[PDB]
Design an enzyme around this catalytic site. Structure first.
Site, PDB file in Angstrom:
ATOM      1  N   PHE A 155       0.830  -1.201   0.000  1.00 59.17           N
ATOM      2  CA  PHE A 155       0.000   0.000   0.000  1.00 59.17           C
ATOM      3  C   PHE A 155       0.869   1.257   0.000  1.00 59.17           C
ATOM      4  O   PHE A 155       1.995   1.243   0.505  1.00 59.17           O
ATOM      5  CB  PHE A 155      -0.950  -0.009   1.201  1.00 59.17           C
ATOM      6  N   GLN A 182      -6.510  15.577   2.308  1.00 62.34           N
ATOM      7  CA  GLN A 182      -5.862  14.541   1.506  1.00 62.34           C
ATOM      8  C   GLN A 182      -6.593  14.325   0.188  1.00 62.34           C
ATOM      9  O   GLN A 182      -7.799  14.063   0.168  1.00 62.34           O
ATOM     10  CB  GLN A 182      -5.759  13.223   2.280  1.00 62.34           C
ATOM     11  N   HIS A 222      -6.933  11.869  -2.727  1.00 63.36           N
ATOM     12  CA  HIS A 222      -6.688  10.521  -3.229  1.00 63.36           C
ATOM     13  C   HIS A 222      -6.464  10.596  -4.738  1.00 63.36           C
ATOM     14  O   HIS A 222      -7.317  11.109  -5.469  1.00 63.36           O
ATOM     15  CB  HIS A 222      -7.851   9.582  -2.898  1.00 63.36           C
ATOM     16  N   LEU A 236     -14.454   6.408  -5.503  1.00 61.34           N
ATOM     17  CA  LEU A 236     -13.099   5.944  -5.223  1.00 61.34           C
ATOM     18  C   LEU A 236     -12.721   4.678  -5.981  1.00 61.34           C
ATOM     19  O   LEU A 236     -13.504   3.729  -6.070  1.00 61.34           O
ATOM     20  CB  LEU A 236     -12.899   5.705  -3.723  1.00 61.34           C
ATOM     21  N   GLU A 285      -6.444   2.331  -3.508  1.00 64.60           N
ATOM     22  CA  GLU A 285      -4.988   2.339  -3.634  1.00 64.60           C
ATOM     23  C   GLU A 285      -4.460   0.901  -3.693  1.00 64.60           C
ATOM     24  O   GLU A 285      -3.295   0.667  -4.022  1.00 64.60           O
ATOM     25  CB  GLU A 285      -4.351   3.125  -2.480  1.00 64.60           C
ATOM     26  N   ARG A 341       0.421   9.569  -0.453  1.00 67.00           N
ATOM     27  CA  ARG A 341      -0.871  10.003  -0.996  1.00 67.00           C
ATOM     28  C   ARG A 341      -0.865  11.444  -1.501  1.00 67.00           C
ATOM     29  O   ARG A 341      -1.488  11.751  -2.519  1.00 67.00           O
ATOM     30  CB  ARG A 341      -1.968   9.826   0.057  1.00 67.00           C
ATOM     31  N   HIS A 371     -10.576  13.503  -0.386  1.00 61.45           N
ATOM     32  CA  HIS A 371     -10.773  12.190   0.213  1.00 61.45           C
ATOM     33  C   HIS A 371     -10.825  12.238   1.738  1.00 61.45           C
ATOM     34  O   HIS A 371     -11.866  11.961   2.338  1.00 61.45           O
ATOM     35  CB  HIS A 371      -9.679  11.227  -0.259  1.00 61.45           C
ATOM     36  N   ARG A 373      -2.131  11.538   5.751  1.00 63.32           N
ATOM     37  CA  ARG A 373      -2.472  10.187   6.182  1.00 63.32           C
ATOM     38  C   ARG A 373      -1.756   9.155   5.310  1.00 63.32           C
ATOM     39  O   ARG A 373      -1.627   9.334   4.097  1.00 63.32           O
ATOM     40  CB  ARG A 373      -3.993   9.977   6.157  1.00 63.32           C
TER      41      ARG A 373
HETATM   42  C1  LIG Z   1     -14.794   8.401   1.731  1.00 68.46           C
HETATM   43  C2  LIG Z   1     -13.917   7.193   1.738  1.00 68.46           C
HETATM   44  C3  LIG Z   1     -13.086   6.983   2.832  1.00 68.46           C
HETATM   45  C4  LIG Z   1     -12.247   5.872   2.867  1.00 68.46           C
HETATM   46  C5  LIG Z   1     -12.246   4.975   1.797  1.00 68.46           C
HETATM   47  C6  LIG Z   1     -13.081   5.189   0.703  1.00 68.46           C
HETATM   48  C7  LIG Z   1     -13.918   6.300   0.668  1.00 68.46           C
HETATM   49  C8  LIG Z   1     -14.810   6.515  -0.523  1.00 68.46           C
HETATM   50  N1  LIG Z   1     -11.415   3.871   1.823  1.00 68.46           N
HETATM   51  C9  LIG Z   1     -10.582   3.645   2.906  1.00 68.46           C
HETATM   52  C10 LIG Z   1      -9.745   2.532   2.939  1.00 68.46           C
HETATM   53  O1  LIG Z   1      -9.740   1.742   2.001  1.00 68.46           O
HETATM   54  N2  LIG Z   1      -8.916   2.314   4.024  1.00 68.46           N
HETATM   55  C11 LIG Z   1      -8.917   3.206   5.082  1.00 68.46           C
HETATM   56  O2  LIG Z   1      -8.187   3.022   6.054  1.00 68.46           O
HETATM   57  N3  LIG Z   1      -9.748   4.307   5.055  1.00 68.46           N
HETATM   58  C12 LIG Z   1     -10.580   4.540   3.974  1.00 68.46           C
HETATM   59  N4  LIG Z   1     -11.411   5.653   3.950  1.00 68.46           N
HETATM   60  C13 LIG Z   1     -11.423   6.608   5.109  1.00 68.46           C
HETATM   61  C14 LIG Z   1     -12.285   6.007   6.230  1.00 68.46           C
HETATM   62  O3  LIG Z   1     -12.788   4.736   5.865  1.00 68.46           O
HETATM   63  C15 LIG Z   1     -13.464   6.879   6.674  1.00 68.46           C
HETATM   64  O4  LIG Z   1     -13.513   8.092   5.950  1.00 68.46           O
HETATM   65  C16 LIG Z   1     -13.363   7.151   8.174  1.00 68.46           C
HETATM   66  O5  LIG Z   1     -13.110   5.937   8.840  1.00 68.46           O
HETATM   67  C17 LIG Z   1     -14.625   7.788   8.746  1.00 68.46           C
HETATM   68  O6  LIG Z   1     -15.232   6.909   9.670  1.00 68.46           O
HETATM   69  P1  LIG Z   1     -15.941   7.436  11.019  1.00 68.46           P
HETATM   70  O7  LIG Z   1     -16.235   6.265  11.927  1.00 68.46           O
HETATM   71  O8  LIG Z   1     -15.077   8.454  11.727  1.00 68.46           O
HETATM   72  O9  LIG Z   1     -17.338   8.094  10.550  1.00 68.46           O
HETATM   73  P2  LIG Z   1     -18.059   7.776   9.140  1.00 68.46           P
HETATM   74  O10 LIG Z   1     -17.792   6.355   8.704  1.00 68.46           O
HETATM   75  O11 LIG Z   1     -17.611   8.760   8.088  1.00 68.46           O
HETATM   76  O12 LIG Z   1     -19.628   7.960   9.437  1.00 68.46           O
HETATM   77  C18 LIG Z   1     -20.105   9.134  10.054  1.00 68.46           C
HETATM   78  C19 LIG Z   1     -21.088   8.762  11.158  1.00 68.46           C
HETATM   79  O13 LIG Z   1     -21.413   9.904  11.928  1.00 68.46           O
HETATM   80  C20 LIG Z   1     -22.819  10.055  12.019  1.00 68.46           C
HETATM   81  N5  LIG Z   1     -23.230  11.474  12.042  1.00 68.46           N
HETATM   82  C21 LIG Z   1     -22.750  12.493  11.259  1.00 68.46           C
HETATM   83  N6  LIG Z   1     -23.391  13.634  11.602  1.00 68.46           N
HETATM   84  C22 LIG Z   1     -24.271  13.360  12.590  1.00 68.46           C
HETATM   85  C23 LIG Z   1     -25.172  14.153  13.295  1.00 68.46           C
HETATM   86  N7  LIG Z   1     -25.557  15.314  12.773  1.00 68.46           N
HETATM   87  N8  LIG Z   1     -25.958  13.572  14.275  1.00 68.46           N
HETATM   88  C24 LIG Z   1     -25.857  12.221  14.548  1.00 68.46           C
HETATM   89  N9  LIG Z   1     -24.962  11.445  13.839  1.00 68.46           N
HETATM   90  C25 LIG Z   1     -24.181  12.003  12.877  1.00 68.46           C
HETATM   91  C26 LIG Z   1     -23.411   9.312  10.833  1.00 68.46           C
HETATM   92  O14 LIG Z   1     -24.673   8.776  11.150  1.00 68.46           O
HETATM   93  C27 LIG Z   1     -22.388   8.225  10.575  1.00 68.46           C
HETATM   94  O15 LIG Z   1     -22.734   7.038  11.253  1.00 68.46           O
END
Ligand SMILES: *Cc1cc2c(cc1C)nc1c(=O)[nH]c(=O)nc-1n2C[C@H](O)[C@H](O)[C@H](O)COP(=O)(O)OP(=O)(O)OC[C@H]1O[C@@H](n2cnc3c(N)ncnc32)[C@H](O)[C@@H]1O
Ligand code: HEM
Ligand SMILES: O=C(Nc1cccc(-c2ccccc2)c1)c1ccccc1I
Ligand code: SF4
Ligand code: F3S
Ligand code: FES
Lengths: 138, 102, 239, 613
Positions: free
Chosen positions: D122, D243, D245, D255, D258, D289, D356, D400
């Site tokens: 990676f 970041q 991507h 996406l 990678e 990245r 990203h 990252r």
């Molecule tokens: C965008 C992305 C990110 C990504 C990826 C591919 C894409 C298209 N591929 C990855 C990969 O292969 N390997 C890796 O290590 N990371 C990768 N990423 C980044 C990563 O997976 C995520 O971006 C990151 O882990 C984010 O996760 P997190 O647990 O912090 O939160 P979330 O998954 O983005 O979900 C958000 C949650 O919050 C709740 N929410 C948001 N606003 C509110 C409010 N207003 N009130 C109540 N709840 C809220 C949502 O419901 C959701 O559950």
């Protein structure tokens, strides 16, 4: 909360609500397997209705089977019109027989893909037309 | 644990393949012994047939039980008549044979 | 320019004496994305922001967009718009479901059924959890292909006629497939009792192999096949 | 007061978010024995981590011999030394323990001949402290790792007594005298406003990637929890660092992993040359990245465009075996077929640098604790936590590393649980909020309920997205940022003139978009003002005026006879950003980066150096 309580809370909320049920039979796309599953239930019900009425009148109606057969000849229907009645009996019987085999093959776990459902389904449908004609003129 | 519903599912397949094997058998070997076995399989598969239909569409705490019994009576009356037919009349095998050369 | 007509199901619980009614929206396919959701977003942002729906990933893995476009239940972000301009695309919510409001179905029952089958690895030895990785062969990992991919979009269950009529007692293809996923999983030790939780006329045996579930799956999975696979295990398992 | 129905819930700990981070933080609390709530605007499975495809980094050593300390170096090196090494220690040290834990939940990782978890190359990783070539420690569920990470954790969360507030948009934090008590949340279902008070609170709302026009992120990545922190007057860290991507579809912006580059895939221009070999030859197209996308964005401007408008580059997977793109990569094989309409087997895929990841967010102590800046020092906000992408422990710093975010969730979501379980007990005195507090969140909600004006809610978002995409893109000069900063400040004045249409109570998706827009602006203003303030090129942030990597020392030659630069002279420091809600005025401070580890003897501090892959 438990899974049961979630299911219980759903129905108490929704049965005592103003929420409308989304359409299902009105809006959903017709397909061969889906329509063929309906006809299997239709032929099942219709086939048991005949089987029940045959044995039911064996205890409730006077005279033997020969006297009832002589009663049919009293109407003296044409050869083509009597063929229609003869075709009318076998057609649901054979459809349900062949599709039954198709159903039983599924129980073994074979032929459970989209291309196969249409293929074996058409095979049943064709085997139904031929066997029923092959028995109406038997 | 106690395999109750799974055994009944198997039971339906067992009689279904038996009934499938009995349609050519009654044609090739028509006798007053094959007459009864056909009546047995025809009514059992038919009872478990409509059984699935009732447990599907009919929804009710009270309405479900009445249909179960209403079907059971109708099945018993069906099987009784076919056995009466195979005894005091022509009999399914010879009966169909007579009907077909009409 | 190019005009495309959309027939969308509408409902508002806040408006007094309102009953379900269809509504038409005209969209230029030239200034809009190639997907159905791209249109649904466009008619909201520009035309009318009264429309309600569930969207997120817009790529086809979150399962929010589960809706009935032109007779079939798929994801709105994956289904491409019929370029045939002489047709009006019909958009409805998932079949035989309580509509909270406008294209948004109450899936709280559906999720609760997923909770009942207990979709987690259960070992007889909970003592060594979080220190050693359980050895699973590549050929035993093959058995999980086509089962783990599930989105829980619900497109299959909500297409099942048997799930329509008996959406309370029958678990449906979406849930049942997951129960199978944890049955053949090499590591899982609680498998007999997983099969025992299906020993009633509804749980598993309300399927009649209509196969409408498999045909409508957005991700091309085979829940019908998997259901039939469970049925055989119920007839074979001993002790 | 009794205008909107108020339901006062009482818990031990609330977790805002159901993604990998919030979910792990949620059930981890319940496992210890805490009466835990989980407030989420989406169904847990329908979060964003579903979209994760690459993998989850852990020095388990299944393909080769591996030391986690090598992964520690890999991360800080990639972080451009803006990464806090005490947090990077804790992460990489727990990486082999956190992943084994996930496999023990039942997560169906791809396997090998031995039967152990599959690991592959990676972008940004290296064996033997950056000497022993390419490293394979990225654990993966065959190109659908995050989906399987979220589903297996969710399934595990049902094994506990956690309360789940499904589809509940949280508005503001329940703050009282610098202490967090929980959240005030609107129920999307019916429009009822709930106050879920607790002794502690975890904020895991993930990225704010929706501030830009072209992004990989979902329609829900609207930096909600970041804003909840900003509206309380608490600082936000490193917000300007975004970041890009390198590999993502030119069309919708979806996406492409990678892992495509990790398996062996190469990035190709319209000329035909392996162009990443021309830039950074040591790691090639499997470099950092920020650096790979830096090369890509530059290659479009020179005249090497691969499209009809000449505004994209190609990603090649043609040379790899056809049945390898079925075992290892089946997810990208389908999504490129649907969106791009391109076969992965005999055709290259159109790729374009898109927004990203957000390494910036809410300042975090390695324990998961939210920090504010008191007296030019670090003070903890009692009973307030953050984990995952929403947080900013700066375990990523300036850039990252490859597939470290899925590690970010599981490790720092674990830490939030452990840091509550060690500080306080379940059933302890849950501090009571005022019978009035949260009133201004409801009043902001109620002003938006009948929002009448000229500029549409949807139109303003589209006016914000293009303002960030044109100004604060991959490259940004001082003059273009200066006009960009006042341009975003212009749009913040257009918040009373905004027009909302749907005026119901049940499932008002029109209303939550405006709430998201408030949160998006609050994330935007600090991304742009922080970027114009930073006068250096560090990691993902690259200034054309100052391509210099400004540190406390010039690290070209040894730090022997060199003068140490004062704190407001260099830029190797975290950008802390505040914003006045009433005028949109941005104030900003700076706090030191942490260079020390948790144990110097066990894990050596990595001194800053001229980093190039
Ligand atoms: C965008 C992305 C990110 C990504 C990826 C591919 C894409 C298209 N591929 C990855 C990969 O292969 N390997 C890796 O290590 N990371 C990768 N990423 C980044 C990563 O997976 C995520 O971006 C990151 O882990 C984010 O996760 P997190 O647990 O912090 O939160 P979330 O998954 O983005 O979900 C958000 C949650 O919050 C709740 N929410 C948001 N606003 C509110 C409010 N207003 N009130 C109540 N709840 C809220 C949502 O419901 C959701 O559950
Ligand atoms: C020997 C030829 C036959 C075969 C191979 C056969 C096969 C089957 C099978 C496998 C089913 C299972 C239903 C399902 O799960 O889809 C079925 C249903 C049924 N059958 Fe038969 N059958 C035959 C003859 C008959 C006859 C002669 C009758 C009339 C007495 C009958 C009555 C029914 C009924 C009422 C059903 C219920 C429909 C349903 O459950 O969907 N069958 N058939
Ligand atoms: O009720 C069944 N289908 C059914 C009944 C009524 C209508 C429709 C239907 C019609 C058109 C489109 C979609 C569904 C489908 C059925 C049929 C065979 C076996 C078991 C069952 I539960
Ligand atoms: S099996 Fe397919 S159709 Fe059914 S819920 Fe899963 S992804 Fe949806
Ligand atoms: S799920 Fe229903 S649609 Fe299918 S295979 Fe069973 S009948
Ligand atoms: S929105 Fe994620 S599946 Fe359509």
């Amino acid at each position: 909360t438990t899974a049961k309580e979630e299911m219980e809370r759903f129905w108490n909320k929704n049965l005592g609500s103003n929420r409308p049920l989304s359409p299902h039979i009105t809006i959903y796309r017709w397909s061969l397997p889906m329509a063929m599953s309906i006809c299997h239930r239709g032929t099942g019900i219709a086939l048991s209705a005949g089987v029940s009425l045959f044995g039911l009148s064996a205890l409730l109606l006077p005279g033997n089977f020969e006297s009832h057969l002589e009663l049919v000849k009293s109407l003296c229907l044409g050869p083509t019109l009597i063929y229609t009645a003869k075709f009318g009996i076998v057609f649901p019987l054979m459809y349900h027989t062949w599709n039954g085999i198709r159903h039983l093959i599924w129980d073994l776990g074979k032929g459970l893909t989209i291309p196969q459902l249409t293929q074996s389904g058409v095979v049943v449908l064709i085997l139904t037309v031929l066997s029923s004609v092959g028995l109406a003129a038997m | 644990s106690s395999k109750a519903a799974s055994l009944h599912w198997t039971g339906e397949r067992v009689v279904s393949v038996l009934l499938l094997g009995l349609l050519p058998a009654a044609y090739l070997n028509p006798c007053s012994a094959m007459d009864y076995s056909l009546a047995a399989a025809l009514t059992l598969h038919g009872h478990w047939g409509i059984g699935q239909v009732v447990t599907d569409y009919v929804r009710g705490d009270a309405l479900q039980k009445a249909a179960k019994a209403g079907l059971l009576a109708l099945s018993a009356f069906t099987f009784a008549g076919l056995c009466y037919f195979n005894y005091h009349d022509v009999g399914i095998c010879k009966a169909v044979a007579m009907l077909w050369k009409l | 320019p190019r005009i495309k007509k959309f027939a969308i199901y509408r409902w508002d619980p806040d408006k007094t004496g309102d009953k379900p009614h269809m509504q038409t929206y005209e969209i230029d396919l030239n200034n809009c994305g190639p997907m159905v959701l791209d249109a649904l977003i466009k008619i909201k942002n520009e035309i009318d922001s009264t429309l309600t729906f569930r969207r997120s990933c817009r790529e086809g893995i979150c399962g929010s967009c589960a809706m009935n476009i032109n007779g079939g239940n798929t994801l709105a972000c994956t289904r491409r718009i019929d370029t045939n301009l002489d047709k009006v695309s019909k958009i409805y919510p998932l079949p035989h479901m309580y509509v909270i409001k406008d294209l948004v179905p109450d899936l709280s029952n559906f999720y609760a059924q997923y909770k009942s089958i207990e979709p987690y690895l259960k070992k007889k030895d909970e003592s060594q959890e979080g220190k050693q990785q359980y050895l699973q062969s590549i050929e035993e990992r093959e058995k999980l292909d086509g089962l783990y991919e599930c989105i829980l979009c619900a497109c299959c269950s909500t297409s099942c006629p048997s799930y329509w009529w008996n959406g309370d007692k029958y678990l449906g293809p979406a849930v049942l497939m997951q129960a199978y996923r944890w049955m053949i999983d090499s590591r899982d030790d609680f498998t007999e009792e997983r099969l025992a939780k299906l020993q009633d006329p509804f749980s598993l045996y309300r399927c009649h192999t209509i196969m409408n579930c498999t045909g409508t799956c957005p991700k091309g999975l085979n829940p019908g096949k998997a259901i039939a696979e469970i049925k055989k295990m119920m007839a074979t398992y001993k002790e | 007061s009794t205008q909107y129905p108020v339901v006062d819930h009482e818990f031990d700990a609330v977790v805002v978010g159901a993604g990998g981070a919030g979910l792990r933080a949620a059930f981890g609390l319940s496992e210890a024995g805490f009466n835990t709530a989980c407030v989420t605007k989406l169904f847990p499975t329908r979060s964003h981590t579903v979209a994760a495809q690459g993998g989850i980094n852990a020095a388990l050593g299944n393909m080769e011999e591996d030391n986690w300390r090598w992964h520690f170096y890999d991360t800080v090196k990639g972080s451009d030394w803006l990464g806090d090494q005490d947090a990077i220690h804790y992460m990489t040290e727990q990486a082999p323990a956190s992943v084994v834990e996930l496999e023990n939940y039942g997560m169906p990782f791809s396997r090998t001949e031995d039967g152990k978890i599959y690991q592959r190359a990676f972008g940004g990783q290296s064996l033997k402290f950056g000497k022993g070539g390419q490293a394979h420690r990225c654990c993966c569920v065959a190109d659908r790792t995050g989906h399987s990470l979220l589903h297996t954790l969710y399934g595990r969360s049902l094994r506990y007594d956690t309360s789940y507030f499904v589809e509940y948009f949280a508005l503001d934090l329940l703050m009282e005298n610098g202490e967090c008590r929980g959240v005030i949340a609107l129920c999307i279902e019916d429009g009822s406003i709930h106050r879920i008070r607790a002794r502690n609170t975890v904020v895991a709302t993930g990225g704010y990637g929706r501030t830009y026009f072209s992004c990989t992120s979902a329609h829900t990545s609207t930096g909600d929890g970041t804003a909840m922190v900003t509206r309380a007057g608490l600082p936000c860290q490193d917000l300007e660092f975004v970041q890009f991507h390198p590999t993502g579809i030119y069309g919708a912006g979806c996406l492409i992993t990678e892992g495509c580059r990790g398996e062996g895939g190469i990035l190709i221009n319209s000329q035909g040359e392996r162009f990443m070999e021309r830039y950074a030859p040591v790691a090639k197209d499997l470099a950092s990245r920020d650096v790979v996308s830096r090369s890509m964005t530059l290659e479009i401007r020179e005249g090497r465009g691969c499209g009809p408008e000449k505004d994209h580059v190609y990603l090649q997977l043609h040379h790899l075996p056809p049945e390898q793109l079925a075992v290892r990569l089946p997810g990208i094989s389908e999504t490129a077929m649907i969106f791009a309409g391109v076969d992965v087997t005999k055709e290259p895929i159109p790729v374009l640098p898109t927004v990203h990841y957000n390494m910036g967010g809410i300042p975090t102590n390695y324990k998961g604790q939210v920090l504010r800046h008191v007296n030019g020092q670090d003070q903890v906000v009692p009973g307030l936590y953050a984990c995952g992408e929403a947080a900013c422990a700066s375990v990523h710093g300036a850039n990252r590393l490859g597939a470290n975010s899925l590690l970010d969730l599981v490790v720092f979501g674990r830490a939030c649980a452990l840091s509550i379980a060690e500080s306080c007990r379940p059933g302890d005195k849950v501090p009571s909020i005022k019978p009035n507090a949260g009133e201004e969140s409801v009043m902001n909600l109620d002003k938006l309920r009948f929002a009448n004006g000229t500029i549409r809610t949807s139109e303003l978002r589209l006016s914000m997205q293009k303002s960030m995409q044109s100004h604060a893109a991959v490259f940004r000069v001082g003059s273009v940022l200066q006009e960009g900063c006042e341009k975003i400040l212009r749009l913040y004045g257009d918040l009373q003139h905004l027009k909302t249409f749907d005026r119901g109570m049940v499932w008002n998706t029109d209303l939550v978009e405006t709430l998201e827009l408030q949160n998006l602006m609050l994330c935007a203003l600090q991304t742009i003002y922080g970027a114009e303030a930073r006068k250096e090129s560090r990691g993902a942030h690259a200034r054309e005026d100052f391509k210099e990597r400004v540190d406390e020392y010039d690290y070209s030659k040894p730090i022997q006879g060199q003068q140490k630069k004062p704190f407001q002279e260099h830029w190797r420091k975290h950008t802390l950003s505040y914003v006045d809600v009433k005028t949109g005025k941005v104030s900003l401070e700076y706090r030191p980066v942490i260079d020390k580890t948790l144990n110097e003897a066990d894990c050596a501090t990595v001194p800053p150096a001229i980093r190039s892959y």
